[PDB]
């Protein structure tokens, strides 16, 4: 294959640039999809949900492709070395321009359209507190933005980035604590020839339940299915003929909602990281997934009538560095911003001999490392459990784990890890907690990312059991679980620490400190994927960790 | 003692019209903790609303010249007037 | 889904009278609440009926898992069959929404609110 997918012919009146889930991912690095998406019968087989050869299958995606390296995590390892890295800010940069420039040659309109999860979770977040993100999306130029983690910065910080943000920032569900009054615009209509588009901005619902309630304080984020219906049929009423929704609330509750609002007939759906070659139809709206890392860029040229949408073209392009043009202007800005940080960054910690991953519903490679970090430093550690996040990196044979990989993986804005003790019935009760959210067969009742990995215990897991019947023959350290006995337990990046009792003379510290510190006396490191889950009724996958 | 907040969601001839009631009082259950004691709000003039303990802090009040009249576990009486 | 048929019993016995078997099944009355709630204390709830002002006679609202079931009571007269409203819950909790009438039968609206931890994803 030439790798000919960005040359594309004219389409439609309107073209949108969309991307979503960067998470401050500056520099070309890996990003392998999860190998299993476990998901409760009901909801088996429809695009969020699909893994491996199931995904290349549906969408009629041929072995050994370009987008089947970005779509499957089937021979990963062999085509990481063969398309070389993906995402990267100068390379996604350069493709937005290219693409932008077709569209303009070709006499339609082009909005570069981003989906939330931007401005944090990298080391060029981190070190500038998302400053330098915000700085280069006026660069590319982008239109519209939503958002979820660029909270977790504070209020003040998010208004402070808001100012320097030459783009529009827009959401509905975002309202006043005491009244309920939108703080910023629900919608925004462009004039596409004769045509008007509407594009209507949706963060996410339950931000104050995933990350601490400090950040924000005097908000209310909560989802108003009354508020959405009338920003859509005010947006028509203006004089827009389709509207477009870029949302943040999750691709299974976005689904939920093009059966239950009317008037939407595109919808730009993040958070859940997957991946759309083909446009998912559910009633009479299309969904397309904004993906993660920026790896991929989806070019969706419309055809406009009317009263809405007529016909869609969505094209998947690979956000390849080894097959883009370079960004001088991009890589210029990102070598002066992270100048004094150069040594720091980039310098090897350690040699990884197999592969890292980070994306799973249950089981992953890299929170087995977290594990076996915290038990090496800490060895009175029972159980470590590590927040299943869909952001992060993949580190493969042979690459070196540098700060830049560490604050990929673990760039929370609260790192500290806490030592604490929990009860078995406490260890059970979390365990099924997260399993009735994760897997419900409503998407109204889903929240956050996966489940969360507990290295040190051993469970069998049911997905279509009902609500305390999911988590069943729990064994910690080979031993069944007792429901009095108190076990030392390790949590970051969550809330487990406030029902445990605090463990007397250990002082909380981030958790990229703590993993550096063991990483730097080991050298290198062979974690080999043992899965310590046993799912019943479906067949748990697993990847080639060599090559 | 009390602050009060009250106002209209133009009304337009024959469309029915909702009230905004929104006050300053830290409402407590007594059940949260050392323990924190119980104090809660327990009326429009055409409708008669009597909360319970499980009340958020400065909570919001939806109904369908206005004066209303907001009693607590204390005794600190919350009025508002809009037109 | 926080369903507790013991705590629920105690309340609608000591106000009402009558206990969980007793009450009738309905999908006239509609009740509007978030699936997951985002604070411990501040909580949305939202009910509404289309049928006339003079049938209402009594709107009660009721927590199973709460240690206190009594949440509100709404007695419109005049005024139309409408109550969002923030309103402190416990844990996990599934809210039930019972409408009294002049006829005598008891309107059922059962709706849940999960109260859960996570991460940013
Ligand atoms: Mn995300
Ligand atoms: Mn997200």
Same mark, same amino acid.
């Given at each position: ?167 529009? +920032? ?13 703080? @910023? ?147 210029? @800005? ?50 470590? +459990? ?162 | ?18 009230? =905004?009631?929104?006050? =300053? ?59 | ?9 105690? *309340? ?24 997951? *709630? ?84």
């Amino acid at each position: 294959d030439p790798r000919s997918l960005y040359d594309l012919p004219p389409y439609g009146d309107a073209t949108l640039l969309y991307f979503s889930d960067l998470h401050g991912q500056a520099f070309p690095h890996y990003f392998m999809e999860p190998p299993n998406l476990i998901a409760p019968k009901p909801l088996m087989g429809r695009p969020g949900y699909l893994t491996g050869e199931a995904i290349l299958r549906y969408y009629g995606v041929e072995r050994g492709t370009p987008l089947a390296y970005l779509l499957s995590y089937v021979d990963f390892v062999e085509l990481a070395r063969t398309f070389g890295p993906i995402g990267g800010m100068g390379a996604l940069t350069a493709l937005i321009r290219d693409q932008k420039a077709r569209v303009e040659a070709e006499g339609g309109k082009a909005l570069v359209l981003d989906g939330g999860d931007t401005w944090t979770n990298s080391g060029l977040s981190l070190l500038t507190r998302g400053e330098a993100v915000v700085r280069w999306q006026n660069l590319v130029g982008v239109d519209h933005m939503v958002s979820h983690c660029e909270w977790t910065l504070g209020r003040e910080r998010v208004e402070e980035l808001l100012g320097l943000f030459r783009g529009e +920032f827009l959401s509905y569900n975002i309202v006043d604590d005491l009244f309920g009054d939108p703080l @910023f615009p629900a919608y925004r209509i462009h004039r596409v020839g004769p045509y008007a588009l509407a594009v209507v901005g949706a963060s996410y619902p339950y931000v104050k339940v995933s990350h601490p309630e400090s950040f924000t304080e005097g908000l209310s984020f909560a989802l108003d299915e009354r508020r959405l219906q009338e920003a859509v049929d005010k947006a028509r009423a203006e004089g827009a003929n389709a509207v477009v929704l870029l949302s943040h609330n999750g691709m299974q509750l976005d689904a939920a909602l093009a059966e239950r609002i009317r008037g939407i007939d595109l919808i730009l759906s993040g958070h859940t990281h997957d991946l759309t070659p083909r446009p998912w139809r559910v009633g009479k709206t299309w969904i397309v997934a904004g993906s993660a890392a920026g790896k991929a860029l989806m070019r969706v040229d419309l055809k406009l009538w009317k009263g809405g949408i007529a016909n869609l073209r969505v094209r998947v392009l690979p956000v390849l560095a080894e097959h883009l043009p370079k960004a001088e202007d991009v890589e210029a @800005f990102l070598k002066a911003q992270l100048a004094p940080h150069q040594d720091h960054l980039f310098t090897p910690l350690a040699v990884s001999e197999t592969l890292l991953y980070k994306r799973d519903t249950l089981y992953s490679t890299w929170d087995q490392l977290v594990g076996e970090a915290v038990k090496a430093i800490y060895p009175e550690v029972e159980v470590v +459990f590590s927040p299943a996040v869909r952001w992060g990196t993949t580190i493969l044979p042979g690459q070196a784990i540098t700060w830049d990989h560490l604050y990929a993986y673990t760039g929370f804005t609260y790192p500290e890890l806490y030592l604490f003790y929990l009860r078995g019935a406490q260890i059970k009760a979390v365990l099924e907690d997260i399993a009735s959210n994760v897997f419900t067969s409503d998407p109204f009742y889903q929240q956050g990312g996966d489940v969360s990995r507990v290295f040190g215990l051993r469970y069998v897991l049911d997905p279509d059991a009902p609500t305390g019947e999911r988590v069943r023959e729990v064994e910690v350290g080979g031993r069944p679980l007792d429901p009095n006995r108190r076990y030392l337990a390790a949590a970051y990046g969550g809330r487990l620490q406030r029902v445990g009792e605090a463990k007397p003379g250990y002082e909380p510290r981030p958790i990229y400190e703590v993993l550096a510190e063991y990483l730097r006396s080991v050298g290198r490191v062979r974690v080999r994927p043992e899965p310590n889950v046993k799912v019943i009724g479906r067949n748990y996958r697993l990847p080639e960790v060599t090559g | 003692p009390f602050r009060t907040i009250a106002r209209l969601n133009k009304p337009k001839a024959g469309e029915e019209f909702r009230l =905004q009631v929104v006050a =300053q009082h830290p409402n407590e259950p007594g059940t949260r903790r050392k323990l924190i004691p119980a104090k809660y709000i327990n009326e429009v003039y055409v409708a008669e609303a009597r909360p319970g303990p499980s009340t958020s802090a400065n909570p919001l009040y939806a109904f369908k010249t206005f004066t209303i009249k907001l009693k607590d576990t204390d005794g600190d009486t919350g009025e508002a007037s809009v037109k | 889904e926080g369903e507790d048929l013991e705590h629920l019993e105690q *309340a609608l016995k000591e106000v009402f009278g009558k206990g969980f078997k007793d009450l009738t099944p309905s999908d006239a009355v509609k009740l509007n609440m978030p699936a997951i *709630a985002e604070s411990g204390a501040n909580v949305p709830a939202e009910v509404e009926v289309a049928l006339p002002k003079e049938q209402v006679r009594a709107i009660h609202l009721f927590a199973d898992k709460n240690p206190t079931p009594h949440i509100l009571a709404f007695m419109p007269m005049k005024a139309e069959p409408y109550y969002a409203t923030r309103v402190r819950l416990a844990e996990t909790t599934a809210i039930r929404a019972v409408v009294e009438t002049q006829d005598g039968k008891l309107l059922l609206a059962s709706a849940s609110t999960r109260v859960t931890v996570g991460g940013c994803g």
